[PDB]
Design a protein around this ligand. Structure first.
Ligand SMILES: [Zn+2]
Ligand SMILES: [Zn+2]
Length: 624
């Protein structure tokens, strides 16, 4: 059935098939094997048909989502690359091509929508979705519009719908639960409501599809569009002075686009599995291989770290203190605490220094922790910032201090107290005294400075779960106060810590007053060693349940990713949108998702159905 002795490749017409062919000639010269590149019609639908009969191409290129439907039947082969190669790619790209611990494909490129804006019409793009209506009113006066994108398809509309808590299918442990769908939740409804209101207020049109949006932006008629790298060439051709940036926020939370991982899967019926893995590992997944493909058709962002760093260069309220659990894709094994002080340093300077300590930590991981170089970088941090730095690196399992610097001096906790706060919250949940979905209502007066999520939920309210997430990940100050009120205030948090053996850490004040940090003021302070030990008691033992531990870990993970610690260690517009987005579920049940959600959006857009009933009907359709 399948030719013995040569490689046949199936890649889509929109992708750089001619660029992959040049890599095919680079392999042909070195080995002496005829590399064929074919682009047939409906290749993602033809592959289930051909591979089932013991036939088909050796290597298939497609987004990872359909690849789950091949691993179920048995059409894809297991992938065995060494860590010497698995390190060269991003840790999340592999988790997109995993089915039951197995590896079914090599990740090549990452696809995610981004905000594209005309620099001539709009030099400074909006940071939030909420400011777009008033910006559209500004631009209509000049015969232009603010934003035009494909409203017909769920994929283009999802980033906004999912932003405030929407999801396709729940991912827990590793398996996607086909019964837990989040297209019906309050977050999804708020998201769709905003879109519908944009349509109702005539900032957008219900008829706008892919070609109407693309032509309107490329002709300079609209200031913004929403698209992926597959559209970049048409804009280059159009000669519009354009930038690509992070999608706007909605209710203080990032837009949540679907993440496609263009992947190269090896056919299970193929007799050339080893011959294909050589071409993919040693030829394609190199700087030179990706170069040829990216030249033919821009891939956007790539799976190979060395080449993404090069592409990221293309021109087209922070943390004084930090707390992090590292080695996280598997159970975290280390706690890091760092505090910076003084009124001299800018946040960019603070962030730069924290990143350098982070970069130093990852460099010497698995070496046993506490490498002399990292202590040098910490001392260098105190130096450059012109004020005391506190630091501790702790092994989560042993409780052993791997490194310390000013471990027993007091430092203002500031935003780091919020993890301890939500630790107390989850403790009341475990006991039956609290529910993560209990909604809390509040007024304008409750709002303090630096409250990006809470200030957009005045009419809606917020669940305890949303408050903890906003407090930790978005550092929402009002959120922390509202959570403090639930447990009884700063004295109760202090009482909670003393009851679990931490007699150092103290919270005395509310937000924003707890942030002021008067020199040597002992209010709202901790020690690096106190904080790390307390964090350890919360993340090990029986102080929280497994479910609560995992949730505390998951809040901290998003905080660590959004923060400075990992910036210089593992650093694009496509990539940054993908990092805050949703990995597209690799199940055939996704077909039911696409059908129902498309119907829901066109019905809510037209006024055929209300937003509530349109998404209820969609939810019913999925879980049927
Ligand atoms: Zn919300
Ligand atoms: Zn005490």
């Amino acid at each position: 059935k399948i030719e013995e002795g040569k490689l046949v490749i199936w890649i889509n017409g929109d992708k750089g098939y001619n660029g992959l062919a040049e890599v095919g000639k680079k392999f042909e010269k070195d080995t002496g094997i005829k590399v064929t590149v074919e682009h047939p019609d409906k290749l993602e639908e033809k592959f289930p048909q051909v591979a089932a009969t013991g036939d088909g191409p050796d290597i298939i290129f497609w987004a990872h989502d359909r690849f789950g439907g091949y691993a179920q039947s048995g059409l894809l082969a297991e992938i065995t690359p060494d860590k010497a190669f698995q390190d060269k790619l991003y840790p999340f790209t592999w988790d997109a091509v995993r089915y039951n611990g197995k590896l079914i494909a090599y990740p090549i490129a990452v696809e995610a929508l981004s905000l594209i804006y005309n620099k001539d019409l709009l030099p400074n793009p909006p940071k939030t979705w909420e400011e777009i209506p008033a910006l559209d009113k500004e631009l209509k006066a000049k015969g232009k519009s603010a934003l035009m994108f494909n409203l017909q398809e769920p994929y283009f509309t999802w980033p906004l719908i999912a932003a405030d808590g929407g999801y396709a299918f729940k991912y827990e442990n590793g398996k996607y639960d086909i019964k837990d769908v989040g297209v019906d939740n309050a977050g999804a409804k708020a998201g769709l409501t905003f879109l519908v209101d944009l349509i109702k207020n005539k900032h957008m049109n219900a008829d706008t599809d892919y070609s109407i949006a693309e032509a309107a932006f490329n002709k300079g008629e609209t200031a913004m569009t929403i698209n992926g790298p597959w559209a970049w060439s048409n804009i280059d051709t159009s000669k519009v002075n354009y930038g690509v940036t992070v999608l706007p926020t909605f209710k203080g939370q990032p837009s949540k686009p679907f993440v496609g991982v263009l992947s190269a899967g090896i056919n299970a019926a193929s007799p050339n599995k080893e011959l294909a893995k050589e071409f993919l590992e040693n030829y394609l997944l190199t700087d030179e291989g990706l170069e040829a493909v990216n030249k033919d058709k821009p891939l956007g962002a790539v799976a190979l770290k060395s080449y993404e760093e090069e592409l990221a260069k293309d021109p087209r309220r922070g943390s004084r203190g930090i707390i992090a659990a590292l080695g996280p894709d598997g159970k975290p094994s280390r706690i890091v605490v760092i505090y910076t002080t003084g009124s001299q340093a800018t946040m960019d300077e603070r962030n730069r220094q924290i990143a350098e300590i982070g970069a130093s930590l990852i460099k010497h991981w698995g070496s046993g922790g506490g490498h002399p170089e990292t202590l040098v970088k910490v001392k260098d941090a105190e130096d450059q910032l012109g004020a005391r730095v506190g630091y501790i690196e702790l092994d989560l399992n042993s409780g052993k201090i791997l490194e310390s610097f000013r471990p027993e001096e007091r430092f203002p906790m500031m935003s780091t107290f919020k993890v301890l706060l939500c630790g107390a919250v989850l403790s009341r949940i475990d006991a039956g005294q609290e529910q993560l979905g209990r909604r809390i209502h509040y007024s304008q007066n409750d709002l303090v400075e630096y409250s990006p999520v809470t200030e957009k939920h005045l009419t809606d309210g917020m669940t305890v779960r949303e408050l903890c997430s906003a407090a930790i990940t978005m550092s929402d100050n009002t959120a922390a106060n509202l959570l403090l009120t639930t447990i009884g205030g700063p004295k109760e948090l202090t009482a909670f810590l003393h009851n679990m053996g931490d007699h150092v850490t103290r919270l005395d004040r509310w937000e924003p007053e707890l942030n002021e940090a008067i020199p040597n003021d002992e209010r709202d302070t901790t020690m690096p060693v106190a904080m790390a030990t307390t964090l350890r008691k919360l993340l090990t033992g029986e102080l929280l349940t497994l479910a609560s531990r995992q949730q505390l870990i998951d809040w901290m993970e998003a905080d660590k990713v959004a923060g400075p610690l990992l910036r210089s260690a593992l650093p694009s517009a496509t990539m940054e949108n993908a990092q805050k987005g949703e990995i597209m579920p690799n199940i055939p049940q996704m077909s039911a998702f696409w059908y129902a959600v498309r119907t829901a959006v066109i019905n809510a857009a037209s006024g055929r159905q209300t937003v509530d009933e349109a998404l209820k009907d969609a939810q019913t359709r999925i879980t049927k």
